[PDB]
Write a protein that binds this DNA or RNA. Structure first.
Lengths: 139, 109, 51, 112
RNA sequence: AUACCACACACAAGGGAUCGUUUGGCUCCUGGGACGAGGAAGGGCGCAGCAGAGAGCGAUAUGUGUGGGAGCAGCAGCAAUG
RNA sequence: GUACCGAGUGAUCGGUGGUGGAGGUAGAUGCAGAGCAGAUCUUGGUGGUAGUAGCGAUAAUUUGUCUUCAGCGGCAAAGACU
RNA sequence: GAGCCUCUAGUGGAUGUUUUACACAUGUAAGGGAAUUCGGCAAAAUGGAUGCGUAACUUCGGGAGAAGUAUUGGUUCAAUUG
RNA sequence: CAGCGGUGUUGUACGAUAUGAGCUUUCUAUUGUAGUAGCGAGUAUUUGAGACACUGGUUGUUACCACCGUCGU
């Protein structure tokens, strides 16, 4: 086709003699308010107290090797939640108690952790602590 | 000039300041951005920058599609002759074997 | 070009002597009313047809 | 006397291209005063106008390659693009052979 | 409508209508109806103290004779020996 | 020619103040190339669109220095191309 | 005297800004492999030289580079065109 | 901008030294002895080397305290 392929071809009929608000057009994308309902808290803790599971007997903080990419190390209290969340690193968010309780079985189940990943987020991260890196390489 | 009429000697990270610039014109736009770096380092946007021919010749050494990673330069500050309301900064090339250990120095004369 | 006939050369010689402005003294004369010589030409704008 | 013209007349005098003429920088007044070919001849004598040397194009690699090909290096099946006959012409092999053989027979007969 | 757009009036721009003027045109009438081998009509090229076009003139390119008589339009020079 | 003011149902007519610098009417009759919004009308002059659309196929350009008086103009040193 | 690279000789300006979307010249792509479309249109794949091996039909000249397969750089040697 | 810590990407720098399928027999002193070599793809050591980036860790050095306008009391 001539005059471009990445477009809506037909934007209306002859009558009514105007464009309808329901047809797609080019413009702003992203930077909108959105609310995500019923996300579940897996863990709560502090950035400088080490922790362990019943199965992983290493004792480590939440901070990965070298920190989070454009942030560094967590120092205060933290929450951990399932799945992804709006916006990039460093943006402010508002938290609210759930508006109504959920009936779904996936939501209301218990959670028991056995491992948490603490490897580097830059490149392929292949160690969980500096002690392992020092032991893999010499000296 | 500067405090106690010293020259400042510094190193310019040509590799970093040109990260976004196109391969086809790297050396042409690098010159515009070397001058910009100087003016922000001494907080003097409206001032003139003057490049000595030896420094020009060092920069163009591998043609238009390349620029050196680091370059060491001596800087002097003088009132601008054609309009002495402005300053002019004069750049001279300093030949070095290695960059390891070289910070920012101020030298008398 | 370099090769010319005698008839072509005289046409060029005459066309070259005629191509001049009004001399600067004539403008001062009481009876004289011309502004510019309308018979002046440029090689960029006209052909002589000497061929 | 504009400096572009000085270069043209110098190029004529020194029997080289305009790209090889160097004008000395410290006396532009002395250059600009020139009027004639005889002025330029003097400036040339005094060394204010100079003919530069030619740019280098060495035969180092060409010689090296040539000697290697004489030893029999390169020249394998992955280095040739023309037919056997293009590289070593067949009519020439014939013509070389039969002239030698005929010359051999001629001498043997004539010597008895 | 602070500043945009429109209209009215005063001043400045932009264009050349109108009125005043005319060493040109047109029409009718009367006279005339005169070229060339003694080279015509028509074409070209030259000629000025400063001179392109046009006018005038032919290497004698403002010469001779007759009748008159005051200047040659600019600048430099000429003129009752015209 | 331009602002105002009066007369007439109306086609039009009259006066006043500035501008202009030499010609102009009222009555009765005569002769006509005798009245314009239009013709994708004819000629000349001017808008909105608009400081907008565009002005950049090709090898490529940088630094100093003099002019220029503000020309990547000239000259030196580099980097490229046919 | 192909394309690509150099010597002799010759060469260049509408300024700054990292510059969204849609374009125009181009690159690359998991698994699938023409399901796309009037239609494999466009693109991809094959490619030089050396050897082995080559069908129907034919006017016996051709078909024929049929098809199908293998080899290829650097170094150091023998042997003399294999 | 540099040190010194930390986290990555690529794959083992330059130069030396040793080895290397093979091919070769040169020189100085001097009568006869001693001295006495060249040419070579590559491979191993020094060397998880060298290069390059980012650090909300820590030390040193260097630069920065202005100015112009509008509305109000």
């Amino acid at each position: 086709s001539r005059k471009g392929k990445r477009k809506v071809a037909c934007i209306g009929a002859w009558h009514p003699a105007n464009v309808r608000r329901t047809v797609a057009r080019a413009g702003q994308l992203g930077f909108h308010r959105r609310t995500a309902q019923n996300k579940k808290i897996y863990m709560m803790g502090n950035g400088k107290t080490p922790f362990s599971t019943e199965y992983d007997l290493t004792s480590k903080t939440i901070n990965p090797m070298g920190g989070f990419l454009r942030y560094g190390n967590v120092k205060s209290d933290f929450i951990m939640v399932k799945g992804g969340i709006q916006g990039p690193s460093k943006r402010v968010l508002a938290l609210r108690k759930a508006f109504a309780p959920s009936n779904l079985g996936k939501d209301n189940e218990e959670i028991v952790l056995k491992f948490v990943d603490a490897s580097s987020k830059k490149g392929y991260g292949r160690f969980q602590t500096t002690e392992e890196k020092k032991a893999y390489f010499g000296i | 000039a500067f405090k106690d009429d010293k020259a400042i000697e510094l190193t310019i990270p040509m590799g970093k300041i040109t990260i976004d610039v196109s391969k086809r014109w790297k050396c042409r736009i690098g010159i515009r951005r070397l001058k910009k770096f100087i003016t922000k380092t001494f907080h003097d946007k409206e001032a003139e920058v003057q490049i000595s021919p030896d420094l020009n010749k060092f920069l163009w050494e591998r043609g238009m599609r390349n620029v050196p990673k680091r370059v060491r330069v001596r800087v002097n500050q003088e009132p601008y002759p054609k309009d002495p309301s402005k300053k002019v900064y004069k750049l001279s090339h300093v030949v070095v074997s290695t960059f390891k250990g070289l910070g920012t120095e101020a030298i008398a004369e | 070009g370099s090769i010319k006939t005698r008839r072509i050369k005289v046409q060029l010689v005459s066309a070259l002597k005629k191509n001049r402005c009004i001399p600067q003294w004539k403008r001062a004369c009481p009876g004289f009313k011309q502004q510019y010589n309308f018979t002046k030409r440029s090689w960029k704008r006209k052909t002589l047809k000497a061929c | 006397m504009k400096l572009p013209r000085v270069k043209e007349l110098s190029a004529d005098i020194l029997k080289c291209g305009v790209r090889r003429i160097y004008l000395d920088t410290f006396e532009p007044s002395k250059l600009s005063a020139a009027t004639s070919r005889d002025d330029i001849r003097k400036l040339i004598k005094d060394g204010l106008i100079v003919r530069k040397a030619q740019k280098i194009h060495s035969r180092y690699h060409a010689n090296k390659l040539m000697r290697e090909k004489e030893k029999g290096r390169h020249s394998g099946p992955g280095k040739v693009k023309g037919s056997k006959n293009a590289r070593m012409p067949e009519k020439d092999k014939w013509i070389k052979r039969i002239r030698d053989l005929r010359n051999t027979l001629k001498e043997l007969r004539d010597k008895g």
